Design a protein around this ligand. Structure first.
Ligand code: ADP
Ligand code: MG
Lengths: 467, 127, 54, 127, 471, 127
């Protein structure tokens, strides 16, 4: 759509003067006369047939006068069923060098939100299969999750176990979207995913579609990575009707990169230093993840809290959209419990009897109670002694020890390491097992036999075999 | 409904998000900011909106319009910039505590800090 | 008699100097956090207004 | 030395004076400031530099490059602007305090506030 | 004369001139005509259409637009040589003491470049001044660089006028005092404290000091260039003559801080907390000309004001790298009467090294600092448990540590008008021996008031006998 | 007086109100603000004032000119911008407090902190 000469290059900001075919805002340009593709996405209009745009690769070797075309659309990306098991950057090019992605139709990355009369009005609960997550902090469908806990906690093994559970009972594929990630750790993620079974370099038996925008790529191309990993995630909602997942790592580097684009243009900053459009920019990304009538998109996002400040402007704005939290802490790994989930500091907004029912509420409020007093009398038994607690306190020692080991589970994606078969438990098998420990029907079981089993019938089975 | 002798009620939810969406509209046109980068007139935004809830006398119909605004606070600060622009407008407050809600008392209304300046003289004699 | 009671009231009155110190730093972390954020904003408006006044 | 099957090691000393040398150059070119008058692209300075340190493979030569960047804080404040970019980029930090330097522990390493993200794979089988 | 420009815009102390014929380069000098005093403007920017942006060195009153401006062809040319000794001089090299003119045969333009990498003397030495905190804990070096930190009112004009007494009279080489913006009262004492003490002689030619004085009643463009008139007289004595020099500057924070007073009027966007965006560049342009090359040596002592006792301020914290030796005076110590106020756990030198000062000097000063950091962990226990709850070993620590803290104090000779005591000057061999014995236990039987304000350890037992006789 | 022989004394009540008359007068002349919107040369504003307070020699007349500048501070904090710029021009200080005034010490002088370069100790002989 016409030819426009360049007229200014300042940093990661290019300035393109068209003649007739003036493109709309959010239109992707393509510079001609270069080695690999340099795209430019139009962000303003300035008058005098001049636009201004944010570059998405290095801005070196650009001469004042180069001819740049117009695609007549936004950034269009390969969207298909043959994009799983592959890796691409923000503008669709493959970077695992396994061959070009041979696809039929393309899709632009900028759309609008679902309509007011396309929503769903009855809240439902997306079971994953994990024991702690299903019960004490359940996921919604269409909901948004927060994942707290850095490296050294048992984190990436949780991500791959989610993807090997969503495709064994639900049938919806996923997307990974690393936003500004490390290039050194994008390869240990790729090479662990190969040997675990989710990406397969031989056939049509993949589950994840990696979209890596990495840390040495300019700030204009770091904000747009969660949209390109959202655009892929809608073909398995719109055009196929499945229950998509979507991982963003992490939700702070999406926010931090928006403040760099907004300060290269010239906009005056907000409170503590962020951009003025901080809640709308998070709005137009987070509103495209809903449960429409065809299918849904779920999301799982890791959050970094700067300077231990839970009222900082970036995690304040992100908490306004969340429907859950998950906290991975260093201490629960020391006990030997996997995954390292803190069941007292992990929440869920739909924890309410009108949404989850009556049976599920009066168990996840009972097993939430028995682990609160044990943290209190983890001091009285630590100073005064052992036999000096009451005989009704020799049962809050048992039933707060038998339970916090049954929050452990042998995963399936780490199959060769543990040597044990990966077990799955449905949502009525989580509830049937936790009720019988507060009822004390299995009060005659040692606290080690409640370790790395599946249903309630296995812990009992495991105990019989011992000794 | 006010000016035709009928009785109305309006509820905003919430007025702290109209003020972050007016801060954006005023930063982008390069107007000088203030405390927490709020513009100079984040008071007149909310005063001229909440001045319109009135009770008219019997010449003008005798109809009424009641307004219940909503503000969100950050970990319990009732001395921030915006919650002291609305406390000094409305005729009372209904404080809700984040400590009372987790302990179990729901609706977690703090009875020691919730008042009504004018609504004492208008309630039923049975109560 | 007066030596046991002098020790077990040196334990209970030290728990209540330790509970009364947890409530004074958590009220002083919050005042510190707001005062930290309000000096980032204060010095930044001094620069934004220092460029645009040129 | 990385493209040819050899190995190397580079020591930037210190990376908190490149970032001030860039900032002098931006604000005289009238590029718009940000927090602490650093330009917007200053995470882009230390991200495209500290990602050239790689461990290549057998089909490219088998080279290496290791980087130890040095950063000076100001009174234990690891939450300023440049010391929070470069903690997010790199693979661990080694944290030296001046309280331990006078209590008789030299080299004055804090063990609690130091980490390496790779760790036990980058050691010999006896250590 | 060349390029007789014309003035167009006097906004503050920043005059802009417009040249018809010949544009002068950056860093020159310009001479405003028609004034009874000499006003010198230095070129700093080139704007377009032959207008430059200068900075005045005096008052900008009476500057009518359209006024002619000459040009000299070089930066500011001061006098220099041997005949500049026992004199006080202006920023543009003029007399301010009313003794007549400076008759020299050599001028030096004040803008030179830092000597290269292949002209760097590498050797370290030691230097003994006489003070039990300098010589024990942060020792100097012959040719090193020495900075005196600390807030306002802690003892920096006293500690720098005591070292002028100690070192700069028993020295064969020369000295220069450059006053960069301080009180004009304090610039009248040191002119008269050294006429009676023989360092300045007003009739013959055997003076051994030179003075450069531009004080804090001066416009802030002339309080940025007396730091450079100093080390241009203090470089002719190192390079041209092969001598040895001493460099005294008080105060060097007024060089940085008077560059922030004309930053935005020049046309720059201000950086962090209010400083100019060229902080660590205009500073390091100057603090590399103060070095010892292989033609001579310079021992530089500079006082460094820390604003509002805030050491993490950007004007002091970028000066901690241009220096070999730091002596940091605190205020919470000088409130206890301890004088010199020098912090024991914050001063630091490079030559504190078991291969230069010896492995007996080193084992002492790393046990003084180790028992003073052992004190502070006990002071948090005393505030709750009280003194008579501690054990008998920890009571021995506090008593020696308070004996050591009082023994680090020493009566200077310039406190003979403030306190009425008499002055000490302790040699190094006694300093090591005295502190070695308090750590051992050989004075555990004395009161602490013996150790306050003495010299050698043999005077701290001649006081514990007078206290017991007058009891 | 001082340039003719006699002895004068001058009180500035106060000098925190000669600064906000310079901040306003020189913002409407379009001069760019510094810290707290004060100009660049508030230190040069007070310093060229407080150095005329001389004590001339006896071959000029020998006259003197004392000065007693008053400074109001906010909440008793002495580390502000305009206080610290004028602490370091004067020879000595008199620190007036509030808890001295209310406990009963009136004039409320902190005699611990009220340091003074004693002025060649011209107290008098009997005192
Ligand atoms: N021997 C001494 N040690 C410490 N302080 C002293 C001594 N003698 C006098 N003083 C007082 O300490 C103050 C230190 O101020 P001074 O060093 O002159 O200026 P600065 O503010 O630059 O430190 C002086 O006013 C003086 O009254
Ligand atoms: Mg002084």
């Amino acid at each position: 759509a016409a030819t426009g000469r360049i007229v200014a290059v300042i940093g990661a900001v290019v300035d393109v003067q068209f003649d007739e075919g003036l493109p709309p805002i959010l239109n992707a340009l393509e510079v001609q006369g270069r080695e690999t593709r340099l795209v430019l996405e139009v962000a303003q209009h300035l008058g005098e047939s001049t636009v201004r745009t944010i570059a998405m690769d290095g801005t070196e070797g650009l001469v004042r006068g180069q001819k740049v075309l117009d695609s007549g659309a936004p950034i269009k990306i390969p969207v298909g069923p043959e994009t799983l098991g592959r890796i691409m950057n923000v503008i669709g090019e493959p970077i695992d060098e396994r061959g070009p992605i041979k696809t039929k139709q393309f899709a632009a990355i900028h759309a609008e939100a679902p309509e007011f009369m396309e929503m769903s009005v009855e809240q439902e609960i997306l079971v994953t299969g994990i024991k702690v997550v299903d019960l004490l902090a359940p996921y919604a469908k269409g909901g948004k999750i927060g994942l707290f806990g850095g490296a050294g906690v048992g984190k990436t093994v949780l991500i791959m176990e989610l993807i090997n559970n969503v495709a064994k009972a639900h049938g919806g594929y996923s997307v990974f979207a690393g936003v500004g990630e490390r290039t050194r750790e994008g390869n240990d993620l790729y090479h662990e995913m190969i040997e675990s079974g989710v990406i397969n370099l031989k056939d049509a038996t993949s589950k994840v579609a990696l979209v890596y925008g990495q840390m040495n790529e300019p700030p204009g191309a770091r904000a747009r990575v969660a949209l390109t990993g959202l655009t892929v995630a809608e073909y398995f909602r719109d055009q196929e009707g499945q229950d998509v997942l979507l991982f963003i790592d992490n939700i702070f580097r999406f926010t931090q990169a928006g403040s760099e684009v907004s300060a290269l243009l010239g906009r005056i900053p907000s409170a503590v230093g962020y951009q003025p459009t901080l809640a709308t920019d998070m709005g137009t990304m987070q509103e495209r993840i809903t449960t429409t009538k065809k299918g849904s998109i779920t999301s799982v996002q890791a959050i970094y809290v700067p300077a231990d400040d839970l009222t900082d402007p970036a995690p304040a704005t992100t908490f306004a959209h969340l429907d859950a939290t998950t906290v991975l802490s260093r201490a629960i790994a020391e006990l030997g419990i996997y995954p390292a989930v803190d069941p007292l500091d992990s929440t869920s907004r739909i924890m309410d009897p009108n949404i989850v029912g009556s049976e599920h509420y009066d168990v996840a409020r009972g097993v939430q109670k028995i682990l609160q007093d044990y943290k209190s009398l983890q001091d009285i038994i630590a100073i005064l002694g052992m036999d000096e607690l009451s005989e009704e306190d020799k049962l809050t020692v048992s039933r707060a020890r038998k339970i916090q080991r049954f929050l452990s589970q042998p995963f399936q994606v780490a199959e060769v390491f543990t040597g044990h078969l990966g077990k799955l438990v449905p949502l009525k098998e989580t509830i049937k097992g936790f009720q019988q420990i507060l009822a004390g029907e299995y009060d005659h079981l040692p606290e080690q036999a409640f370790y790395m089993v599946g249903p309630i019938e296995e812990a009992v089975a495991k105990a019989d075999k011992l000794a | 409904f006010r000016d035709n002798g009928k009785h109305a009620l309006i509820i905003y939810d919430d007025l702290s998000k109209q003020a972050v969406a007016y801060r954006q509209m005023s930063l982008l046109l390069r107007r000088p900011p203030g405390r927490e980068a709020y513009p100079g007139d984040v008071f007149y935004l909310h005063s001229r909106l909440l001045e319109r809830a009135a009770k008219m006398n019997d010449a003008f119909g005798g109809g009424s319009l009641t307004a219940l605004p909503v503000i969100e606070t950050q970990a319990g600060d009732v001395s921030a910039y915006i919650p002291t622009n609305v406390i000094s407008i409305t005729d009372g407050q209904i404080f809700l505590e984040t400590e009372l809600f987790y302990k179990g008392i729901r609706p977690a209304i703090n009875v020691g800090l919730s008042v009504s300046r004018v609504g004492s003289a208008a309630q039923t004699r049975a109560m | 008699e007066s030596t046991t009671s002098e020790q077990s009231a040196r334990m209970t009155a030290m728990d209540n100097a330790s509970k009364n110190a947890s409530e004074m730093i958590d009220k002083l972390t919050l005042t510190f956090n707001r005062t930290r954020q309000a000096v980032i904003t204060k010095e930044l408006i001094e620069i934004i207004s220092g460029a645009a006044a040129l």
